[PDB]
Design an enzyme around this catalytic site. Structure first.
Site, PDB file in Angstrom:
ATOM      1  CG  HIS A   1      -0.130   0.141   2.534  1.00  0.00           C
ATOM      2  ND1 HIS A   1       0.456  -0.922   3.189  1.00  0.00           N
ATOM      3  CD2 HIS A   1       0.116   1.233   3.298  1.00  0.00           C
ATOM      4  CE1 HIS A   1       1.043  -0.490   4.296  1.00  0.00           C
ATOM      5  NE2 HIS A   1       0.866   0.816   4.375  1.00  0.00           N
TER       6      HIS A   1
ATOM      7  NE  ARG B   1      -5.050  -4.091  -2.729  1.00  0.00           N
ATOM      8  CZ  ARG B   1      -4.278  -4.227  -1.647  1.00  0.00           C
ATOM      9  NH1 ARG B   1      -2.953  -4.131  -1.728  1.00  0.00           N
ATOM     10  NH2 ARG B   1      -4.847  -4.411  -0.466  1.00  0.00           N
TER      11      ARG B   1
ATOM     12  CG  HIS C   1      -8.425  -3.512   6.831  1.00  0.00           C
ATOM     13  ND1 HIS C   1      -7.298  -4.281   6.868  1.00  0.00           N
ATOM     14  CD2 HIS C   1      -8.362  -2.709   7.910  1.00  0.00           C
ATOM     15  CE1 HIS C   1      -6.604  -3.974   7.944  1.00  0.00           C
ATOM     16  NE2 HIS C   1      -7.246  -3.046   8.602  1.00  0.00           N
TER      17      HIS C   1
ATOM     18  CG  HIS D   1      -9.132  -2.312  12.926  1.00  0.00           C
ATOM     19  ND1 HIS D   1      -8.039  -2.507  13.742  1.00  0.00           N
ATOM     20  CD2 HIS D   1      -8.639  -2.004  11.697  1.00  0.00           C
ATOM     21  CE1 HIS D   1      -6.934  -2.294  13.054  1.00  0.00           C
ATOM     22  NE2 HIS D   1      -7.271  -1.985  11.806  1.00  0.00           N
TER      23      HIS D   1
ATOM     24  CG  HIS E   1     -25.662 -31.921  26.391  1.00  0.00           C
ATOM     25  ND1 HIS E   1     -26.640 -32.754  25.887  1.00  0.00           N
ATOM     26  CD2 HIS E   1     -25.706 -30.793  25.641  1.00  0.00           C
ATOM     27  CE1 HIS E   1     -27.235 -32.163  24.865  1.00  0.00           C
ATOM     28  NE2 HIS E   1     -26.686 -30.973  24.696  1.00  0.00           N
TER      29      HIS E   1
HETATM   30  N1  LIG Z   1      -4.622  -1.037   8.728  1.00  0.00           N
HETATM   31  C1  LIG Z   1      -5.267  -0.143   7.696  1.00  0.00           C
HETATM   32  C2  LIG Z   1      -5.645  -0.975   6.480  1.00  0.00           C
HETATM   33  C3  LIG Z   1      -6.174  -0.203   5.280  1.00  0.00           C
HETATM   34  C4  LIG Z   1      -6.607  -1.220   4.218  1.00  0.00           C
HETATM   35  C5  LIG Z   1      -6.873  -0.543   2.893  1.00  0.00           C
HETATM   36  N2  LIG Z   1      -7.037  -1.585   1.809  1.00  0.00           N
HETATM   37  C6  LIG Z   1      -6.523   0.462   8.320  1.00  0.00           C
HETATM   38  O1  LIG Z   1      -7.044  -0.042   9.319  1.00  0.00           O
HETATM   39  O2  LIG Z   1      -7.028   1.480   7.828  1.00  0.00           O
HETATM   40 CO   LIG Z   2      -6.076  -1.792  10.116  1.00  0.00          CO
END
Ligand SMILES: N[C@@H](CCCC[NH3+])C(=O)O
Ligand SMILES: [Co+2]
Ligand SMILES: N[C@@H](CCCC[NH3+])C(=O)O
Ligand SMILES: [Co+2]
Lengths: 347, 347
Positions: free
Chosen positions: A71, A126, A188, A190, A285
């Site tokens: 990236h 991308r 992506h 979290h 159980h």
């Molecule tokens: N660790 C980055 C990943 C970005 C992924 C973009 N394809 C985030 O949480 O933003």
């Molecule tokens: Co991230």
């Protein structure tokens, strides 16, 4: 729905508090992910540091089946460094978050895409939004729709871990409408609100084609979609597909490898590989408690290694050679034979 | 959307492989949950065993603010035992799962509900489907709609942990249509596919009013919606509501208590209380990597304790007495004063 995994153990995973992977550690991780069958391996941007650059170069030239990608920010100098490493794909980041000048964003993007298209036409391009789910969707869609004719894939990133599953679904459907038939979509997510796996699933339900995972979900904070947990989610819905594409029986090796490197214990309740993932209290159980006389089982532990011309000669050659190679390594298992042969015999 | 938590640490949690709570352990857990502000505490059915019955009796007569509730199969003899324990609510289970005679189900249910209504009119009656998300929705809705006029609440239970967030949302909307304005809806979700928190959230989005959680998500297999993770999810959406209703700053005490009792370590990445829940790799927040110059923060650690006549005299009396009691215990914190007073002063 078909889909691919972008492993981020060597990008997102480097943000994990306890991670400090040597070049050797990364090679070991990437080789194991490649054997497992992961399609993409993302590494920290080579512009981050001299070591990030050196590591990207090493990994990109390992001759893996998996594509090694990275990236950058939308800068020509970053693009230049990334291309030079020999990576097979480059993700350009932008941000429009309320918590952070759209015409500038679009112009800088096209400038960099143009450079990459000319300098390295074989490289995947991308284009992804940092903190997607605190950004106004009309701003996102504007940028995606402007760049889509020129890129291979667009990305949504729940950087802060607040997206809800139905938000991910809605926005993915909207992005699909705007980028058209050719352009793929990556997600992506979290895990700060416990939705990373559910969000990754819903992105796929909506038409996304790529999801980021890390082994054990290691990453910044409580990390992102974990490989094991994600595979569990997908296996229950598409078991034949999942078991064909990935060497699921090696999951415990991958979890153990990373756990050892970063110095954590596998969580007691970790998906699949945790101590209690398949168990329950002996004697509890009871027919007074549950209607079904058996203790429920969502998937089997052993699946995850837990205790006129003619056509097809090229594939016959590849298949026979591969089966023979496994046999001579003492690695030819029934699981391997199944995933190698099921697509040729069954219909 | 407003909603309540049903803690299941003393029902679902007893199915956890390593759990073996003494009567004293349960009292300690229930008292802590009550102080925390949890609305309901579910215990293992008193018909399960002599000890289950004794424990239900003890817990139901502790004088907690939280309501102590239990569950039964649709049997008059079970209903009788459950009523005798003095529990304030009784959930009747049925099952129509494809993996397991609707007229019989409905008749046996009405017989038992009738008994409870007559013997203990003050007791909440709940009616829930085992393995909801492998059951045909038309079978579920048929049963719910038949029993709803006579019960206080209906329950959906993802016993096997395969439901997807959008399935939970859809089915909850359907159940709401069928049970009408009065009847509440509870959700119980297992985490085998990583969706327990996301599913609990989506049930609430759709109109559900009650969700089951356990401390650390302990339970059968990899367990159910964890208290901490669920509170994180809800806090990001309704922070004032969540921080008012629960003593969030005591979360680490609850996680530690249960971890010690069952002999596990808190997962490295556990929501809120895990070692790395708020952290990242020192030096890895690079401007080359992230657009936002700050490392993101979904919620603050300290919130979770991590390092003409007149009217209102009755409430004034209660509030002043409570603040004074806290002060004299050395427990009057700014967090406590905020949650006690915000609803009186702000508007
Ligand atoms: N660790 C980055 C990943 C970005 C992924 C973009 N394809 C985030 O949480 O933003
Ligand atoms: Co991230
Ligand atoms: N542990 C039970 C809970 C049922 C809840 C019904 N209100 C299950 O997974 O089915
Ligand atoms: Co359960």
């Amino acid at each position: 729905r078909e889909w691919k995994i972008i492993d981020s153990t060597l990008r997102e995973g480097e943000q994990f508090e306890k991670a400090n992977f040597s070049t050797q550690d990364k090679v070991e991780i990437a080789k194991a992910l490649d054997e497992f069958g992961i399609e993409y391996i993302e590494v920290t941007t080579p512009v981050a540091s001299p070591q990030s650059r050196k590591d990207a170069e090493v990994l990109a030239s390992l001759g893996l089946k998996a594509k090694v990608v990275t990236h950058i920010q939308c800068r020509l100098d970053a693009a230049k460094v990334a291309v030079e490493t020999g990576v097979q794909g480059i993700d350009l980041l932008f941000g429009t978050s309320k918590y952070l000048d759209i015409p500038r964003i679009i112009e800088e993007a096209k400038e960099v895409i143009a450079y990459i298209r000319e300098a390295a036409p074989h490289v995947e391009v991308r284009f992804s939004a940092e903190d997607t789910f605190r950004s106004e969707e009309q701003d996102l869609l504007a940028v995606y729709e402007a760049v889509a004719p020129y890129v291979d894939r667009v990305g949504l990133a729940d950087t802060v871990g607040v997206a809800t599953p139905r938000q991910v679904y809605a926005l993915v459907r909207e992005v699909r409408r705007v980028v058209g038939p050719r352009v793929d979509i990556e997600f992506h997510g979290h895990n700060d609100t416990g939705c990373a796996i559910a969000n990754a699933y819903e992105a796929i339900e909506a038409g996304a084609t790529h999801v980021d995972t890390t082994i054990l979900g290691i990453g910044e904070r409580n990390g992102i979609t974990p490989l094991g947990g994600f595979l569990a989610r997908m296996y229950t819905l598409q078991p034949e597909y999942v078991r064909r594409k990935y060497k699921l029986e090696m999951l415990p090796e991958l979890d153990r490898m990373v756990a050892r490197m970063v110095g954590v214990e596998i969580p007691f309740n970790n998906y699949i590989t945790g101590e209690t993932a398949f168990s329950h209290k002996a004697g509890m159980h009871l027919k007074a408690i549950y209607i079904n006389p058996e203790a429920y089982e969502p998937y089997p532990p052993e699946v995850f290694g837990v205790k006129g011309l003619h056509y097809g000669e090229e594939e016959l050659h590849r298949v026979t050679q591969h089966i023979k190679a496994l046999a001579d390594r003492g690695q030819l298992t029934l699981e391997e034979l199944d995933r190698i042969l099921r697509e040729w015999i069954t219909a």
